[PDB]
């Protein structure tokens, strides 16, 4: 996260880090005690991933962590890495053993199909991750969160030559400065309502990090809510 503030311990209990070939390479969010959501481009064919929940500082041990392993990688059927690396960027991670919820680990709420689009239309959204703080620079050690406003679709298509599909939205500021970066991809984009938080996006990609004209593009979870509830049911 570029231009983000430090997250207090417990402020984002749904946050989840992903470890594999490189430690802390992507983020994730807790659906329930057994399932994690992340970007499909973070986990490809034959990937050795472990999921750590309840994390604040990566290198420090705060005894609030819950380390688990993935045993079933569920990518969306419409995802094709050979066509587009971010078309239908969503994935499901089934853990080996069901977690136990507390104060530092908590699933994120997911509404139905219609409302998930309503919560997104509010405008304000929060993103968090352990990715790069600067463009091609150092990676964050503590959880960094950032509030980003929803930019209209008409402005987003005219800002980049790459195509923006229907199941993707854009968010960010005009003068750059505050934007997600590499490493944050896979984590949560959430909007709050009267205290309760509801998942509405996943960090997908963007042109560099924090630049005028460019915006962070996210995945529209509203188009996959019915697919998330049916696959993560108990």
């Amino acid at each position: 996260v570029v231009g983000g503030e430090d997250a207090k311990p417990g402020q984002f209990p749904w946050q989840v880090v992903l470890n594999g070939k490189v430690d802390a390479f992507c983020g994730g969010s807790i659906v329930n005690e057994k399932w994690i959501v992340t970007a499909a481009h973070c986990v490809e064919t034959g990937v050795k991933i472990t999921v750590v929940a309840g994390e604040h500082n990566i290198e420090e041990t705060e005894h609030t962590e819950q380390k688990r392993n993935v045993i079933r990688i569920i990518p969306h059927h419409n995802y094709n890495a050979a066509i587009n690396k971010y078309n239908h960027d969503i994935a499901l991670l089934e853990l080996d053993e069901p977690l136990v919820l507390n104060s530092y680990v908590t699933p994120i709420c997911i509404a139905d199909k219609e409302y998930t689009n309503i919560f997104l239309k509010f405008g304000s959204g929060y993103v968090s991750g352990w990715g790069r703080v600067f463009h091609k620079g150092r990676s964050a050690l503590v959880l960094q969160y950032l509030r980003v406003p929803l930019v209209d679709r008409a402005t987003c298509l005219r800002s980049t030559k790459f195509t923006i599909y229907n199941n993707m939205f854009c968010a960010g500021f005009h003068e750059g400065g505050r934007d997600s970066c590499q490493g944050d991809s896979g984590g949560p984009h959430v909007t709050e309502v009267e205290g309760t938080s509801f998942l509405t996006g996943i960090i997908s990609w963007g042109e560099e990090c924090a630049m005028k004209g460019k915006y962070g593009i996210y995945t529209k979870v509203s188009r996959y809510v019915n697919w998330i509830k049916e696959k993560t049911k108990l």
Epitope: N84, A154, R158, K161, F162, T163
Partner: T-cell receptor
Framework: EVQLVESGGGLVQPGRSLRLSCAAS????????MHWVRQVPGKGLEWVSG??????????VDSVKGRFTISRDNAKNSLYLQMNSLRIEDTALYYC???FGSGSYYNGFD | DIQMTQSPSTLSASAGDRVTISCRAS??????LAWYQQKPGKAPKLLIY???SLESGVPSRFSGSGSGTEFTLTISSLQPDDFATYYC?????????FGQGTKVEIKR
């Protein structure tokens, strides 16, 4: 400077086919979308078809939808247009246009 | 889809005058409008984009204004070289409808 050279125009019977070539030069051909725009002497300027930077997004005007085909060769820096089942109403001057700024598919031409 | 209407169809003015060309849209294209100038026998060249932005290299005597459904183009201090047909174009939709164009004649 930026230069776009058309070719392949001429006279053809109704129902036949040609193939226009637009050779680009003086800019990064890979970072800009390209379009075909015709000037009909009775109508005026009219956008005919457009292609994205990597042949991903393709759009046609309703009059040529199903008869015209647009393609590009980023290695050769060339844009092509394949006209099929040509009608007398297709007579016009066919310009080659490149999007400005960010090279977006929904951008105007410079 | 979106009907672009230019006004006037043609006009004549002397050198050093101030010209105003209007361009009205049937809907609301926000600020997605471009102005082109085509001299006889020449290809159209981009002048003003995004309603009010000026393309690099274009003289400062050209100015663009307007937002929403009404747009105007202004040529301060008319020059004989500015004889051409000026077109307005919206790029809000994928059709990119052009205007009917306005021919600018010179009075001498």
């Amino acid at each position: 400077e930026v230069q776009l050279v058309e070719s392949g125009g001429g006279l053809v019977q109704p129902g036949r086919s040609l193939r226009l070539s637009c050779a680009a030069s003086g800019f990064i051909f890979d970072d800009y979308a390209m379009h075909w725009v015709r000037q009909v002497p009775g109508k005026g300027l009219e956008w005919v078809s457009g292609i994205s930077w990597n042949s991903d997004n393709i759009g046609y005007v309703d009059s040529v939808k199903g008869r015209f085909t647009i393609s590009r060769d980023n290695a050769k820096n060339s844009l092509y247009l394949q006209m099929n089942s040509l009608r007398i109403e297709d007579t016009a001057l066919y310009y080659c246009a490149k999007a400005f700024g960010s090279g977006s598919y929904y951008n105007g031409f410079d | 889809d979106i009907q672009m209407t230019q006004s006037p169809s043609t006009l004549s003015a002397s050198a050093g005058d101030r010209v105003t060309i209007s361009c009205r849209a049937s809907q609301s294209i926000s600020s997605w409008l471009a102005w082109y100038q085509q001299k006889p026998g020449k290809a159209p060249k981009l002048l003003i984009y995004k309603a009010s932005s000026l393309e690099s290299g274009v003289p400062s005597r050209f100015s663009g204004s307007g937002s929403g459904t009404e747009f105007t183009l202004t040529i301060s201090s008319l020059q004989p070289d500015d004889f051409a047909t000026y077109y307005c174009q919206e790029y809000n939709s994928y059709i990119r409808t052009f205007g009917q164009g306005t021919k600018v004649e010179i009075k001498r």
